[PDB]
Design an enzyme around this catalytic site. Sequence first.
Site, mmCIF file in Angstrom:
data_model
loop_
_atom_site.group_PDB
_atom_site.id
_atom_site.type_symbol
_atom_site.label_atom_id
_atom_site.label_comp_id
_atom_site.label_asym_id
_atom_site.label_seq_id
_atom_site.Cartn_x
_atom_site.Cartn_y
_atom_site.Cartn_z
ATOM 1 N NE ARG A 142 9.583 3.397 -0.183
ATOM 2 C CZ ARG A 142 10.022 2.596 0.777
ATOM 3 N NH1 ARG A 142 10.716 1.503 0.502
ATOM 4 N NH2 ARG A 142 9.756 2.896 2.044
ATOM 5 C CB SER A 143 4.941 7.628 -3.921
ATOM 6 O OG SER A 143 4.997 8.836 -4.656
ATOM 7 C CD1 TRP A 144 2.721 3.980 -8.242
ATOM 8 C CD2 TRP A 144 0.581 3.770 -7.637
ATOM 9 N NE1 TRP A 144 2.401 2.647 -8.292
ATOM 10 C CE2 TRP A 144 1.092 2.492 -7.923
ATOM 11 C CE3 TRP A 144 -0.753 3.891 -7.235
ATOM 12 C CZ2 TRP A 144 0.318 1.340 -7.820
ATOM 13 C CZ3 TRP A 144 -1.519 2.746 -7.132
ATOM 14 C CH2 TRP A 144 -0.982 1.488 -7.423
ATOM 15 N NE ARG A 168 6.970 -13.607 2.003
ATOM 16 C CZ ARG A 168 8.273 -13.451 2.193
ATOM 17 N NH1 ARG A 168 8.962 -14.277 2.963
ATOM 18 N NH2 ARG A 168 8.900 -12.443 1.596
ATOM 19 C CB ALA A 180 -2.910 5.167 1.593
ATOM 20 C CB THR A 181 -1.082 6.441 -4.164
ATOM 21 O OG1 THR A 181 0.227 6.526 -3.590
ATOM 22 C CG2 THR A 181 -1.233 7.515 -5.223
ATOM 23 C CG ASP A 202 -1.979 1.101 1.110
ATOM 24 O OD1 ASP A 202 -2.942 0.941 0.334
ATOM 25 O OD2 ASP A 202 -1.837 2.117 1.818
ATOM 26 N N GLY A 203 2.040 1.254 0.541
ATOM 27 C CA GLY A 203 2.846 2.465 0.548
ATOM 28 C C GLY A 203 2.230 3.550 1.409
ATOM 29 C CB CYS A 231 10.340 -1.317 -8.791
ATOM 30 S SG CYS A 231 10.685 0.325 -8.116
HETATM 31 N N1 LIG Z 1 6.842 -7.937 2.878
HETATM 32 C C1 LIG Z 1 6.041 -6.894 2.686
HETATM 33 N N2 LIG Z 1 4.718 -6.962 3.061
HETATM 34 C C2 LIG Z 1 3.893 -5.877 2.859
HETATM 35 N N3 LIG Z 1 4.383 -4.724 2.284
HETATM 36 C C3 LIG Z 1 5.683 -4.651 1.913
HETATM 37 C C4 LIG Z 1 6.530 -5.731 2.108
HETATM 38 N N4 LIG Z 1 7.753 -5.389 1.652
HETATM 39 C C5 LIG Z 1 7.698 -4.124 1.178
HETATM 40 N N5 LIG Z 1 6.421 -3.655 1.332
HETATM 41 C C6 LIG Z 1 5.926 -2.324 0.946
HETATM 42 O O1 LIG Z 1 5.738 -2.252 -0.453
HETATM 43 C C7 LIG Z 1 6.005 -0.940 -0.908
HETATM 44 C C8 LIG Z 1 6.582 -0.951 -2.321
HETATM 45 S S1 LIG Z 1 6.991 0.713 -2.909
HETATM 46 C C9 LIG Z 1 5.336 0.943 -3.606
HETATM 47 C C10 LIG Z 1 4.452 1.816 -2.721
HETATM 48 C C11 LIG Z 1 3.105 2.206 -3.321
HETATM 49 N N6 LIG Z 1 3.015 1.739 -4.697
HETATM 50 C C12 LIG Z 1 2.895 3.710 -3.207
HETATM 51 O O2 LIG Z 1 1.818 4.230 -3.489
HETATM 52 O O3 LIG Z 1 3.799 4.443 -2.815
HETATM 53 C C13 LIG Z 1 6.949 -0.316 0.106
HETATM 54 O O4 LIG Z 1 6.457 0.944 0.495
HETATM 55 C C14 LIG Z 1 6.938 -1.251 1.296
HETATM 56 O O5 LIG Z 1 6.510 -0.556 2.439
#
Ligand SMILES: Nc1ncnc2c1ncn2[C@@H]1O[C@H](CSCC[C@H](N)C(=O)O)[C@@H](O)[C@H]1O
Lengths: 154, 431, 439, 340
Positions: free
Chosen positions: B410-412, B216, B172-173, B169-170, B238
């Site tokens: 690393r967000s959207w 997981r 929450a975008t 979720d990051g 990524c």
């Molecule tokens: N094992 C895990 N379980 C749940 N979330 C995880 C994880 N490993 C990494 N993440 C989360 O996955 C995200 C990937 S970056 C992508 C964030 C999102 N797309 C946004 O809107 O910003 C990271 O912020 C991290 O917090």
Amino acid sequence: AARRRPIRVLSLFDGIATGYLVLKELGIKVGKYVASEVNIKYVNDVRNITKKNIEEWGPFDLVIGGSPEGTGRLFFEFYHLLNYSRPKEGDDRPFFWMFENVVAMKVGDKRDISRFLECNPVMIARYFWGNLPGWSVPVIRHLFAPLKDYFACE
Amino acid sequence: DQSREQMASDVANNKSSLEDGCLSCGRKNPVSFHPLFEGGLCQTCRDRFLELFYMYDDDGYQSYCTVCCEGRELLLCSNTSCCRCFCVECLEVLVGTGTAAEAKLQEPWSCYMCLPQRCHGVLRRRKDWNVRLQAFFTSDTGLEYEAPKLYPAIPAARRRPIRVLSLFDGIATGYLVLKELGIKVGKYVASEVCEESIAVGTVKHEGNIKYVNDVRNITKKNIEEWGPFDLVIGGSPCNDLSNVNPARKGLYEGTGRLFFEFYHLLNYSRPKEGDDRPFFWMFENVVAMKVGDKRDISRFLECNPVMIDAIKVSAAHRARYFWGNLPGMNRPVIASKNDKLELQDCLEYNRIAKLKKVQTITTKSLFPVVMNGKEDVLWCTELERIFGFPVHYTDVSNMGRGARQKLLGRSWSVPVIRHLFAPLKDYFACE
Amino acid sequence: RGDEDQSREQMASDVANNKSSLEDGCLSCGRKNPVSFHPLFEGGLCQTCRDRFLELFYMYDDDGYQSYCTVCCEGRELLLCSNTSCCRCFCVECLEVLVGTGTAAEAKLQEPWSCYMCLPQRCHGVLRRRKDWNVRLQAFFTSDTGLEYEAPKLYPAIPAARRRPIRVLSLFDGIATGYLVLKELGIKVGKYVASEVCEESIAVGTVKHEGNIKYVNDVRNITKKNIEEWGPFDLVIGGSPCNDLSNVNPARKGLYEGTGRLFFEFYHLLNYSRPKEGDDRPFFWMFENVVAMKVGDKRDISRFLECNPVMIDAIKVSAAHRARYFWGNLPGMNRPVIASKNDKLELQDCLEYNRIAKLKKVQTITKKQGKNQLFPVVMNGKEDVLWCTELERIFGFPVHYTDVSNMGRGARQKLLGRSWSVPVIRHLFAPLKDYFACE
Amino acid sequence: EDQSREQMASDVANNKSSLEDGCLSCGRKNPVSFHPLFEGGLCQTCRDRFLELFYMYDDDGYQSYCTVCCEGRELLLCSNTSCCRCFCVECLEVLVGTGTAAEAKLQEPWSCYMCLPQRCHGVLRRRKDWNVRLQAFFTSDTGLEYEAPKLYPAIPAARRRPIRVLSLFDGIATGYLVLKELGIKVGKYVASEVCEESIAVGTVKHEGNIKYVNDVRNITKKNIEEWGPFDLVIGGSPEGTGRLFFEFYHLLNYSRPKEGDDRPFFWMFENVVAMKVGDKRDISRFLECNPVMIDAIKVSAAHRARYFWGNLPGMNRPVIASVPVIRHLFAPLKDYFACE
Ligand SMILES: Nc1ncnc2c1ncn2[C@@H]1O[C@H](CSCC[C@H](N)C(=O)O)[C@@H](O)[C@H]1O
Ligand SMILES: Nc1ncnc2c1ncn2[C@@H]1O[C@H](CSCC[C@H](N)C(=O)O)[C@@H](O)[C@H]1O
Ligand SMILES: [Zn+2]
Ligand SMILES: [Zn+2]
Ligand SMILES: [Zn+2]
Ligand SMILES: [Zn+2]
Ligand SMILES: [Zn+2]
Ligand SMILES: [Zn+2]
Ligand SMILES: [Zn+2]
Ligand SMILES: [Zn+2]
Ligand SMILES: [Zn+2]
């Protein structure tokens, strides 16, 4: 509830092609032998299997595969093939599968593949997976001995 | 292995055309073309050109050669609002010998697109590079998968609130975009595992997000306890499958195996046979990843990725692959009346922007701002305006420059996502 | 051991058996010749002890506990009030001598404890509490000290027809609290000259106020021609640094030396920028410093500026402990402070979502540094520390005020700690609206 | 890059580098100013110490540190009388040649390089006109350009009125004897000093309207308004240095004539040279004046290097050789005030 049709199978990594010989040794014949790697039939690779291919050649009964480079490469292609060859929801046709792996593999992979297959791991200094009640050929012979549960039996 | 010399000599004689000439390779029989100049490209060069184009070095310029994508050092263009660098030996062989040194002895240097030009040598530009480059990445050919089936329209008084799921979720975008469109959210289950990120969703959204746990750990039984769902968002980490780190592990090893946690959990929540309710999904990852895995994500999801570059709607350089089956996902991008296209729109008082478009932004930090006659850099409250986030959004839980910038790197992009979710106002509740 | 210098038990027995009283002897050394009263209990103090009740009373440790006894202000031994809402501590030497022998023995083993300011009032021998100790404490710090100076002149009231924007000179500006408060009241600021040397405070005051205030270089480089050009000024505000004036620093230098010399820059520029003889325009000024400082420095400052300070505690208007002295001549500077309806008076009124405060008011305005420094608030059933957004609310500043120049926790907290308090400054500046133009 | 002292000495011996390209004291490059005794540059890190650590003399009458380095690892006294020059071991042996310090430390009685006339022994040569360089280094060498104080008119023989002084920071009698040697009528004298007793005119046989006062912490504006007006204010060093200056400044501010006053008003303030640069600039800024040095070893034994911040007429005029310096400074006052 007796005298079923000859079994048909789909598999990954047919390899030594001993599956047909093992099936014939038990005293039964395989209705259709299907395999895909690059009456053992070889046509194409795992990487070029589509949904329509399973539609024309399916449905199947069980799958012999496993992991005899990275484990994920073959494991997740196996998972995709099994998810494509799964029987439709809310039915009653018998269905089996099988996955093989070596003992030397990290605990994290154990966690992921136990979460994915949704079946708890079962040890044999050897590993086996699946929901089937029951290399080195004696274990395959032991697994294929109760095959008559969903095979041609009067 | 015919070296480019004799074909370069022949094509100047008008004995043939460059439709059989691989600009970066020389060898004939091309399976594709080149979307900047007239010519073609072979399969081996095309694979490298797909990947290596869309990155950018710390100096603010294209890392490798534009045409050959090879070499250790070459000339650098010195024109503002341009970053492309040309190769040295790519000129004295094809466009003409002797221009590699005469341009080097004089400053400033200008690349061949900065200055208007004609067909120097045999390097004639494509008259429509702007639209020829766009069709190279989206109109590819992996398996020519079938188009998705449009669901029948749903009229008024039969619209129910959406039950959103979200993995990785990051910050929450998705919730922020869904509450800006106007859609009525009835539920949102997020699976962030970062303490700094959870404190942003909790405080800013007033605890309307049911933060559950690590991705997981969600087993099969939990879906029907929380479900049934209608929209399954997801973007895998990524940092592994990219041509930026020396490790560069594949999709099946390392943290790159976190994509399957999205497909597997998408399988559970889709309607069973005989159910005809609207159901949607989406996926998102980087473009600067090997072509040997770009045809994997597309195969498992059985779809073709679109490309949307943020430069058409924002003031930053960011472009990535979007999967999914949203309705009208292939329409051309159109900006709006409330966008921030250039840097001067996203700056504080008493500051003047030298440039017009920031380059790619990442975790790590030429300087783009000058105030009081002194060179300066961008603040943490200025990176939020670029991406469309509300100002002071990340001012939570005692963070400084090193944390309020890693999360935004690393967000959207808010107006990029607002472009995909817009046709979702017709099947679910509104107002 | 002499007659004038008698022991404590002598006077204790003399008052216990009615041969003497308590208001004739000192309560920390047993001497005769009292010079004042005791603000909390009943009795007197000697000139050696009155001149240390004025320094060390308002000093607290890093964990929110007084470092010295509440009676004698001498920490021979330290046992604390284990109950919350108290930082007090009573010394052992004061317990058995006055209350009774062996009292500290049971006061140490029984758990929890509750100080004599917590218990319902009784008379534990000769240690008894006054009915109105707060009212006498408020007059202890603002009475009978030094000499008496003539009352500052009061200007006649100016009608609203002829009023002009206020021109302000602010030495040691900080983060421009004066401009913020003056705009909140609604007074038209026609000019604001600020003298600051810190590169981040300039950034805050430039970004937030859209460059409406004019900056000047160091205060040691301002001549008289500068003041003649920039004037006529109408409000010379200033607060000198207290790095080497507070008695907390073991290596103190005080006035006349080191950083303490900067009071004289304020003195000099205030002399330069005041109306000449035969001028009848309203001139106001103000200087402030800390309460915890030596009486010599405070009396020298009072002698130079020719006025007596007042003490305003930023606890009747906010949720913090902040005691300061204020020299000036603003109208109504000695009227009681009353909180308003839009005052966040407790800690729970200045918190984020899903956070619960355990205290009601915080100690001196911070992160012995254990079990009470990492535990001012609770969130998700765990101990957490305050946030910068919450310090900005405690001090009364607009939210996200110091979110400029991408500085972290340390810089923002440092800038906020040595700042002023908005409610106090608003209380002081409120009567200025009768002399200048509003809105 | 950083060259050593011996390497610098060898470079200068070969004349490969000039004498105005490096600091003379620390032996490093980047000069900021010149050295007064010899010829040589001075880095700012070494230059500042010289104005504050050059005239440190003990009560015995010797230089506190070496005349060259001024870093007191060792001291070599000069046997000549009335000489206040000292030498270390490194400043000669390292710089002008090996064995020079050892040779100069054995011939008793010993004559320092300053005592003997100008000779260029090695790589160090005395300046031809260092007598004015010494003065140029200290006074008016750094600071602002404060306008010179105006010159008051003269009142010729027309009702010269007796003086009335407020001596603040000196000896109680010092400043009164000098005022009597010249024969000037004293119409009032209100003395004071740092903390002492408060008493009437009676402490000694002195009866000169001496309203002696205790600690300055007792004088208020009412006293100055009642005891005044005044015509001359004194002060200076007789803990720290801030107390004296700031009390004197406060009392000068109180006693200063109001706007539009034409009557003469003179003041002064003196201090020893051994004070930091910050104190010097603070005094100059607050008093709006620059100090002039009056070297006084030749005119007054055991007294020298006193700065003076005043508006007395002709302060910096050249002298022609307790009593002497103050008498010379106060002599011009006979033109304005009563005589005999
Ligand atoms: N094992 C895990 N379980 C749940 N979330 C995880 C994880 N490993 C990494 N993440 C989360 O996955 C995200 C990937 S970056 C992508 C964030 C999102 N797309 C946004 O809107 O910003 C990271 O912020 C991290 O917090
Ligand atoms: N030499 C100097 N000249 C002018 N200001 C100085 C100074 N040295 C320090 N200061 C400033 O004086 C300030 C004193 S802290 C008090 C600031 C003010 N009362 C407020 O509202 O916060 C410091 O912030 C410091 O930046
Ligand atoms: Zn090629
Ligand atoms: Zn190239
Ligand atoms: Zn260019
Ligand atoms: Zn006492
Ligand atoms: Zn005590
Ligand atoms: Zn208590
Ligand atoms: Zn030097
Ligand atoms: Zn020396
Ligand atoms: Zn000598």
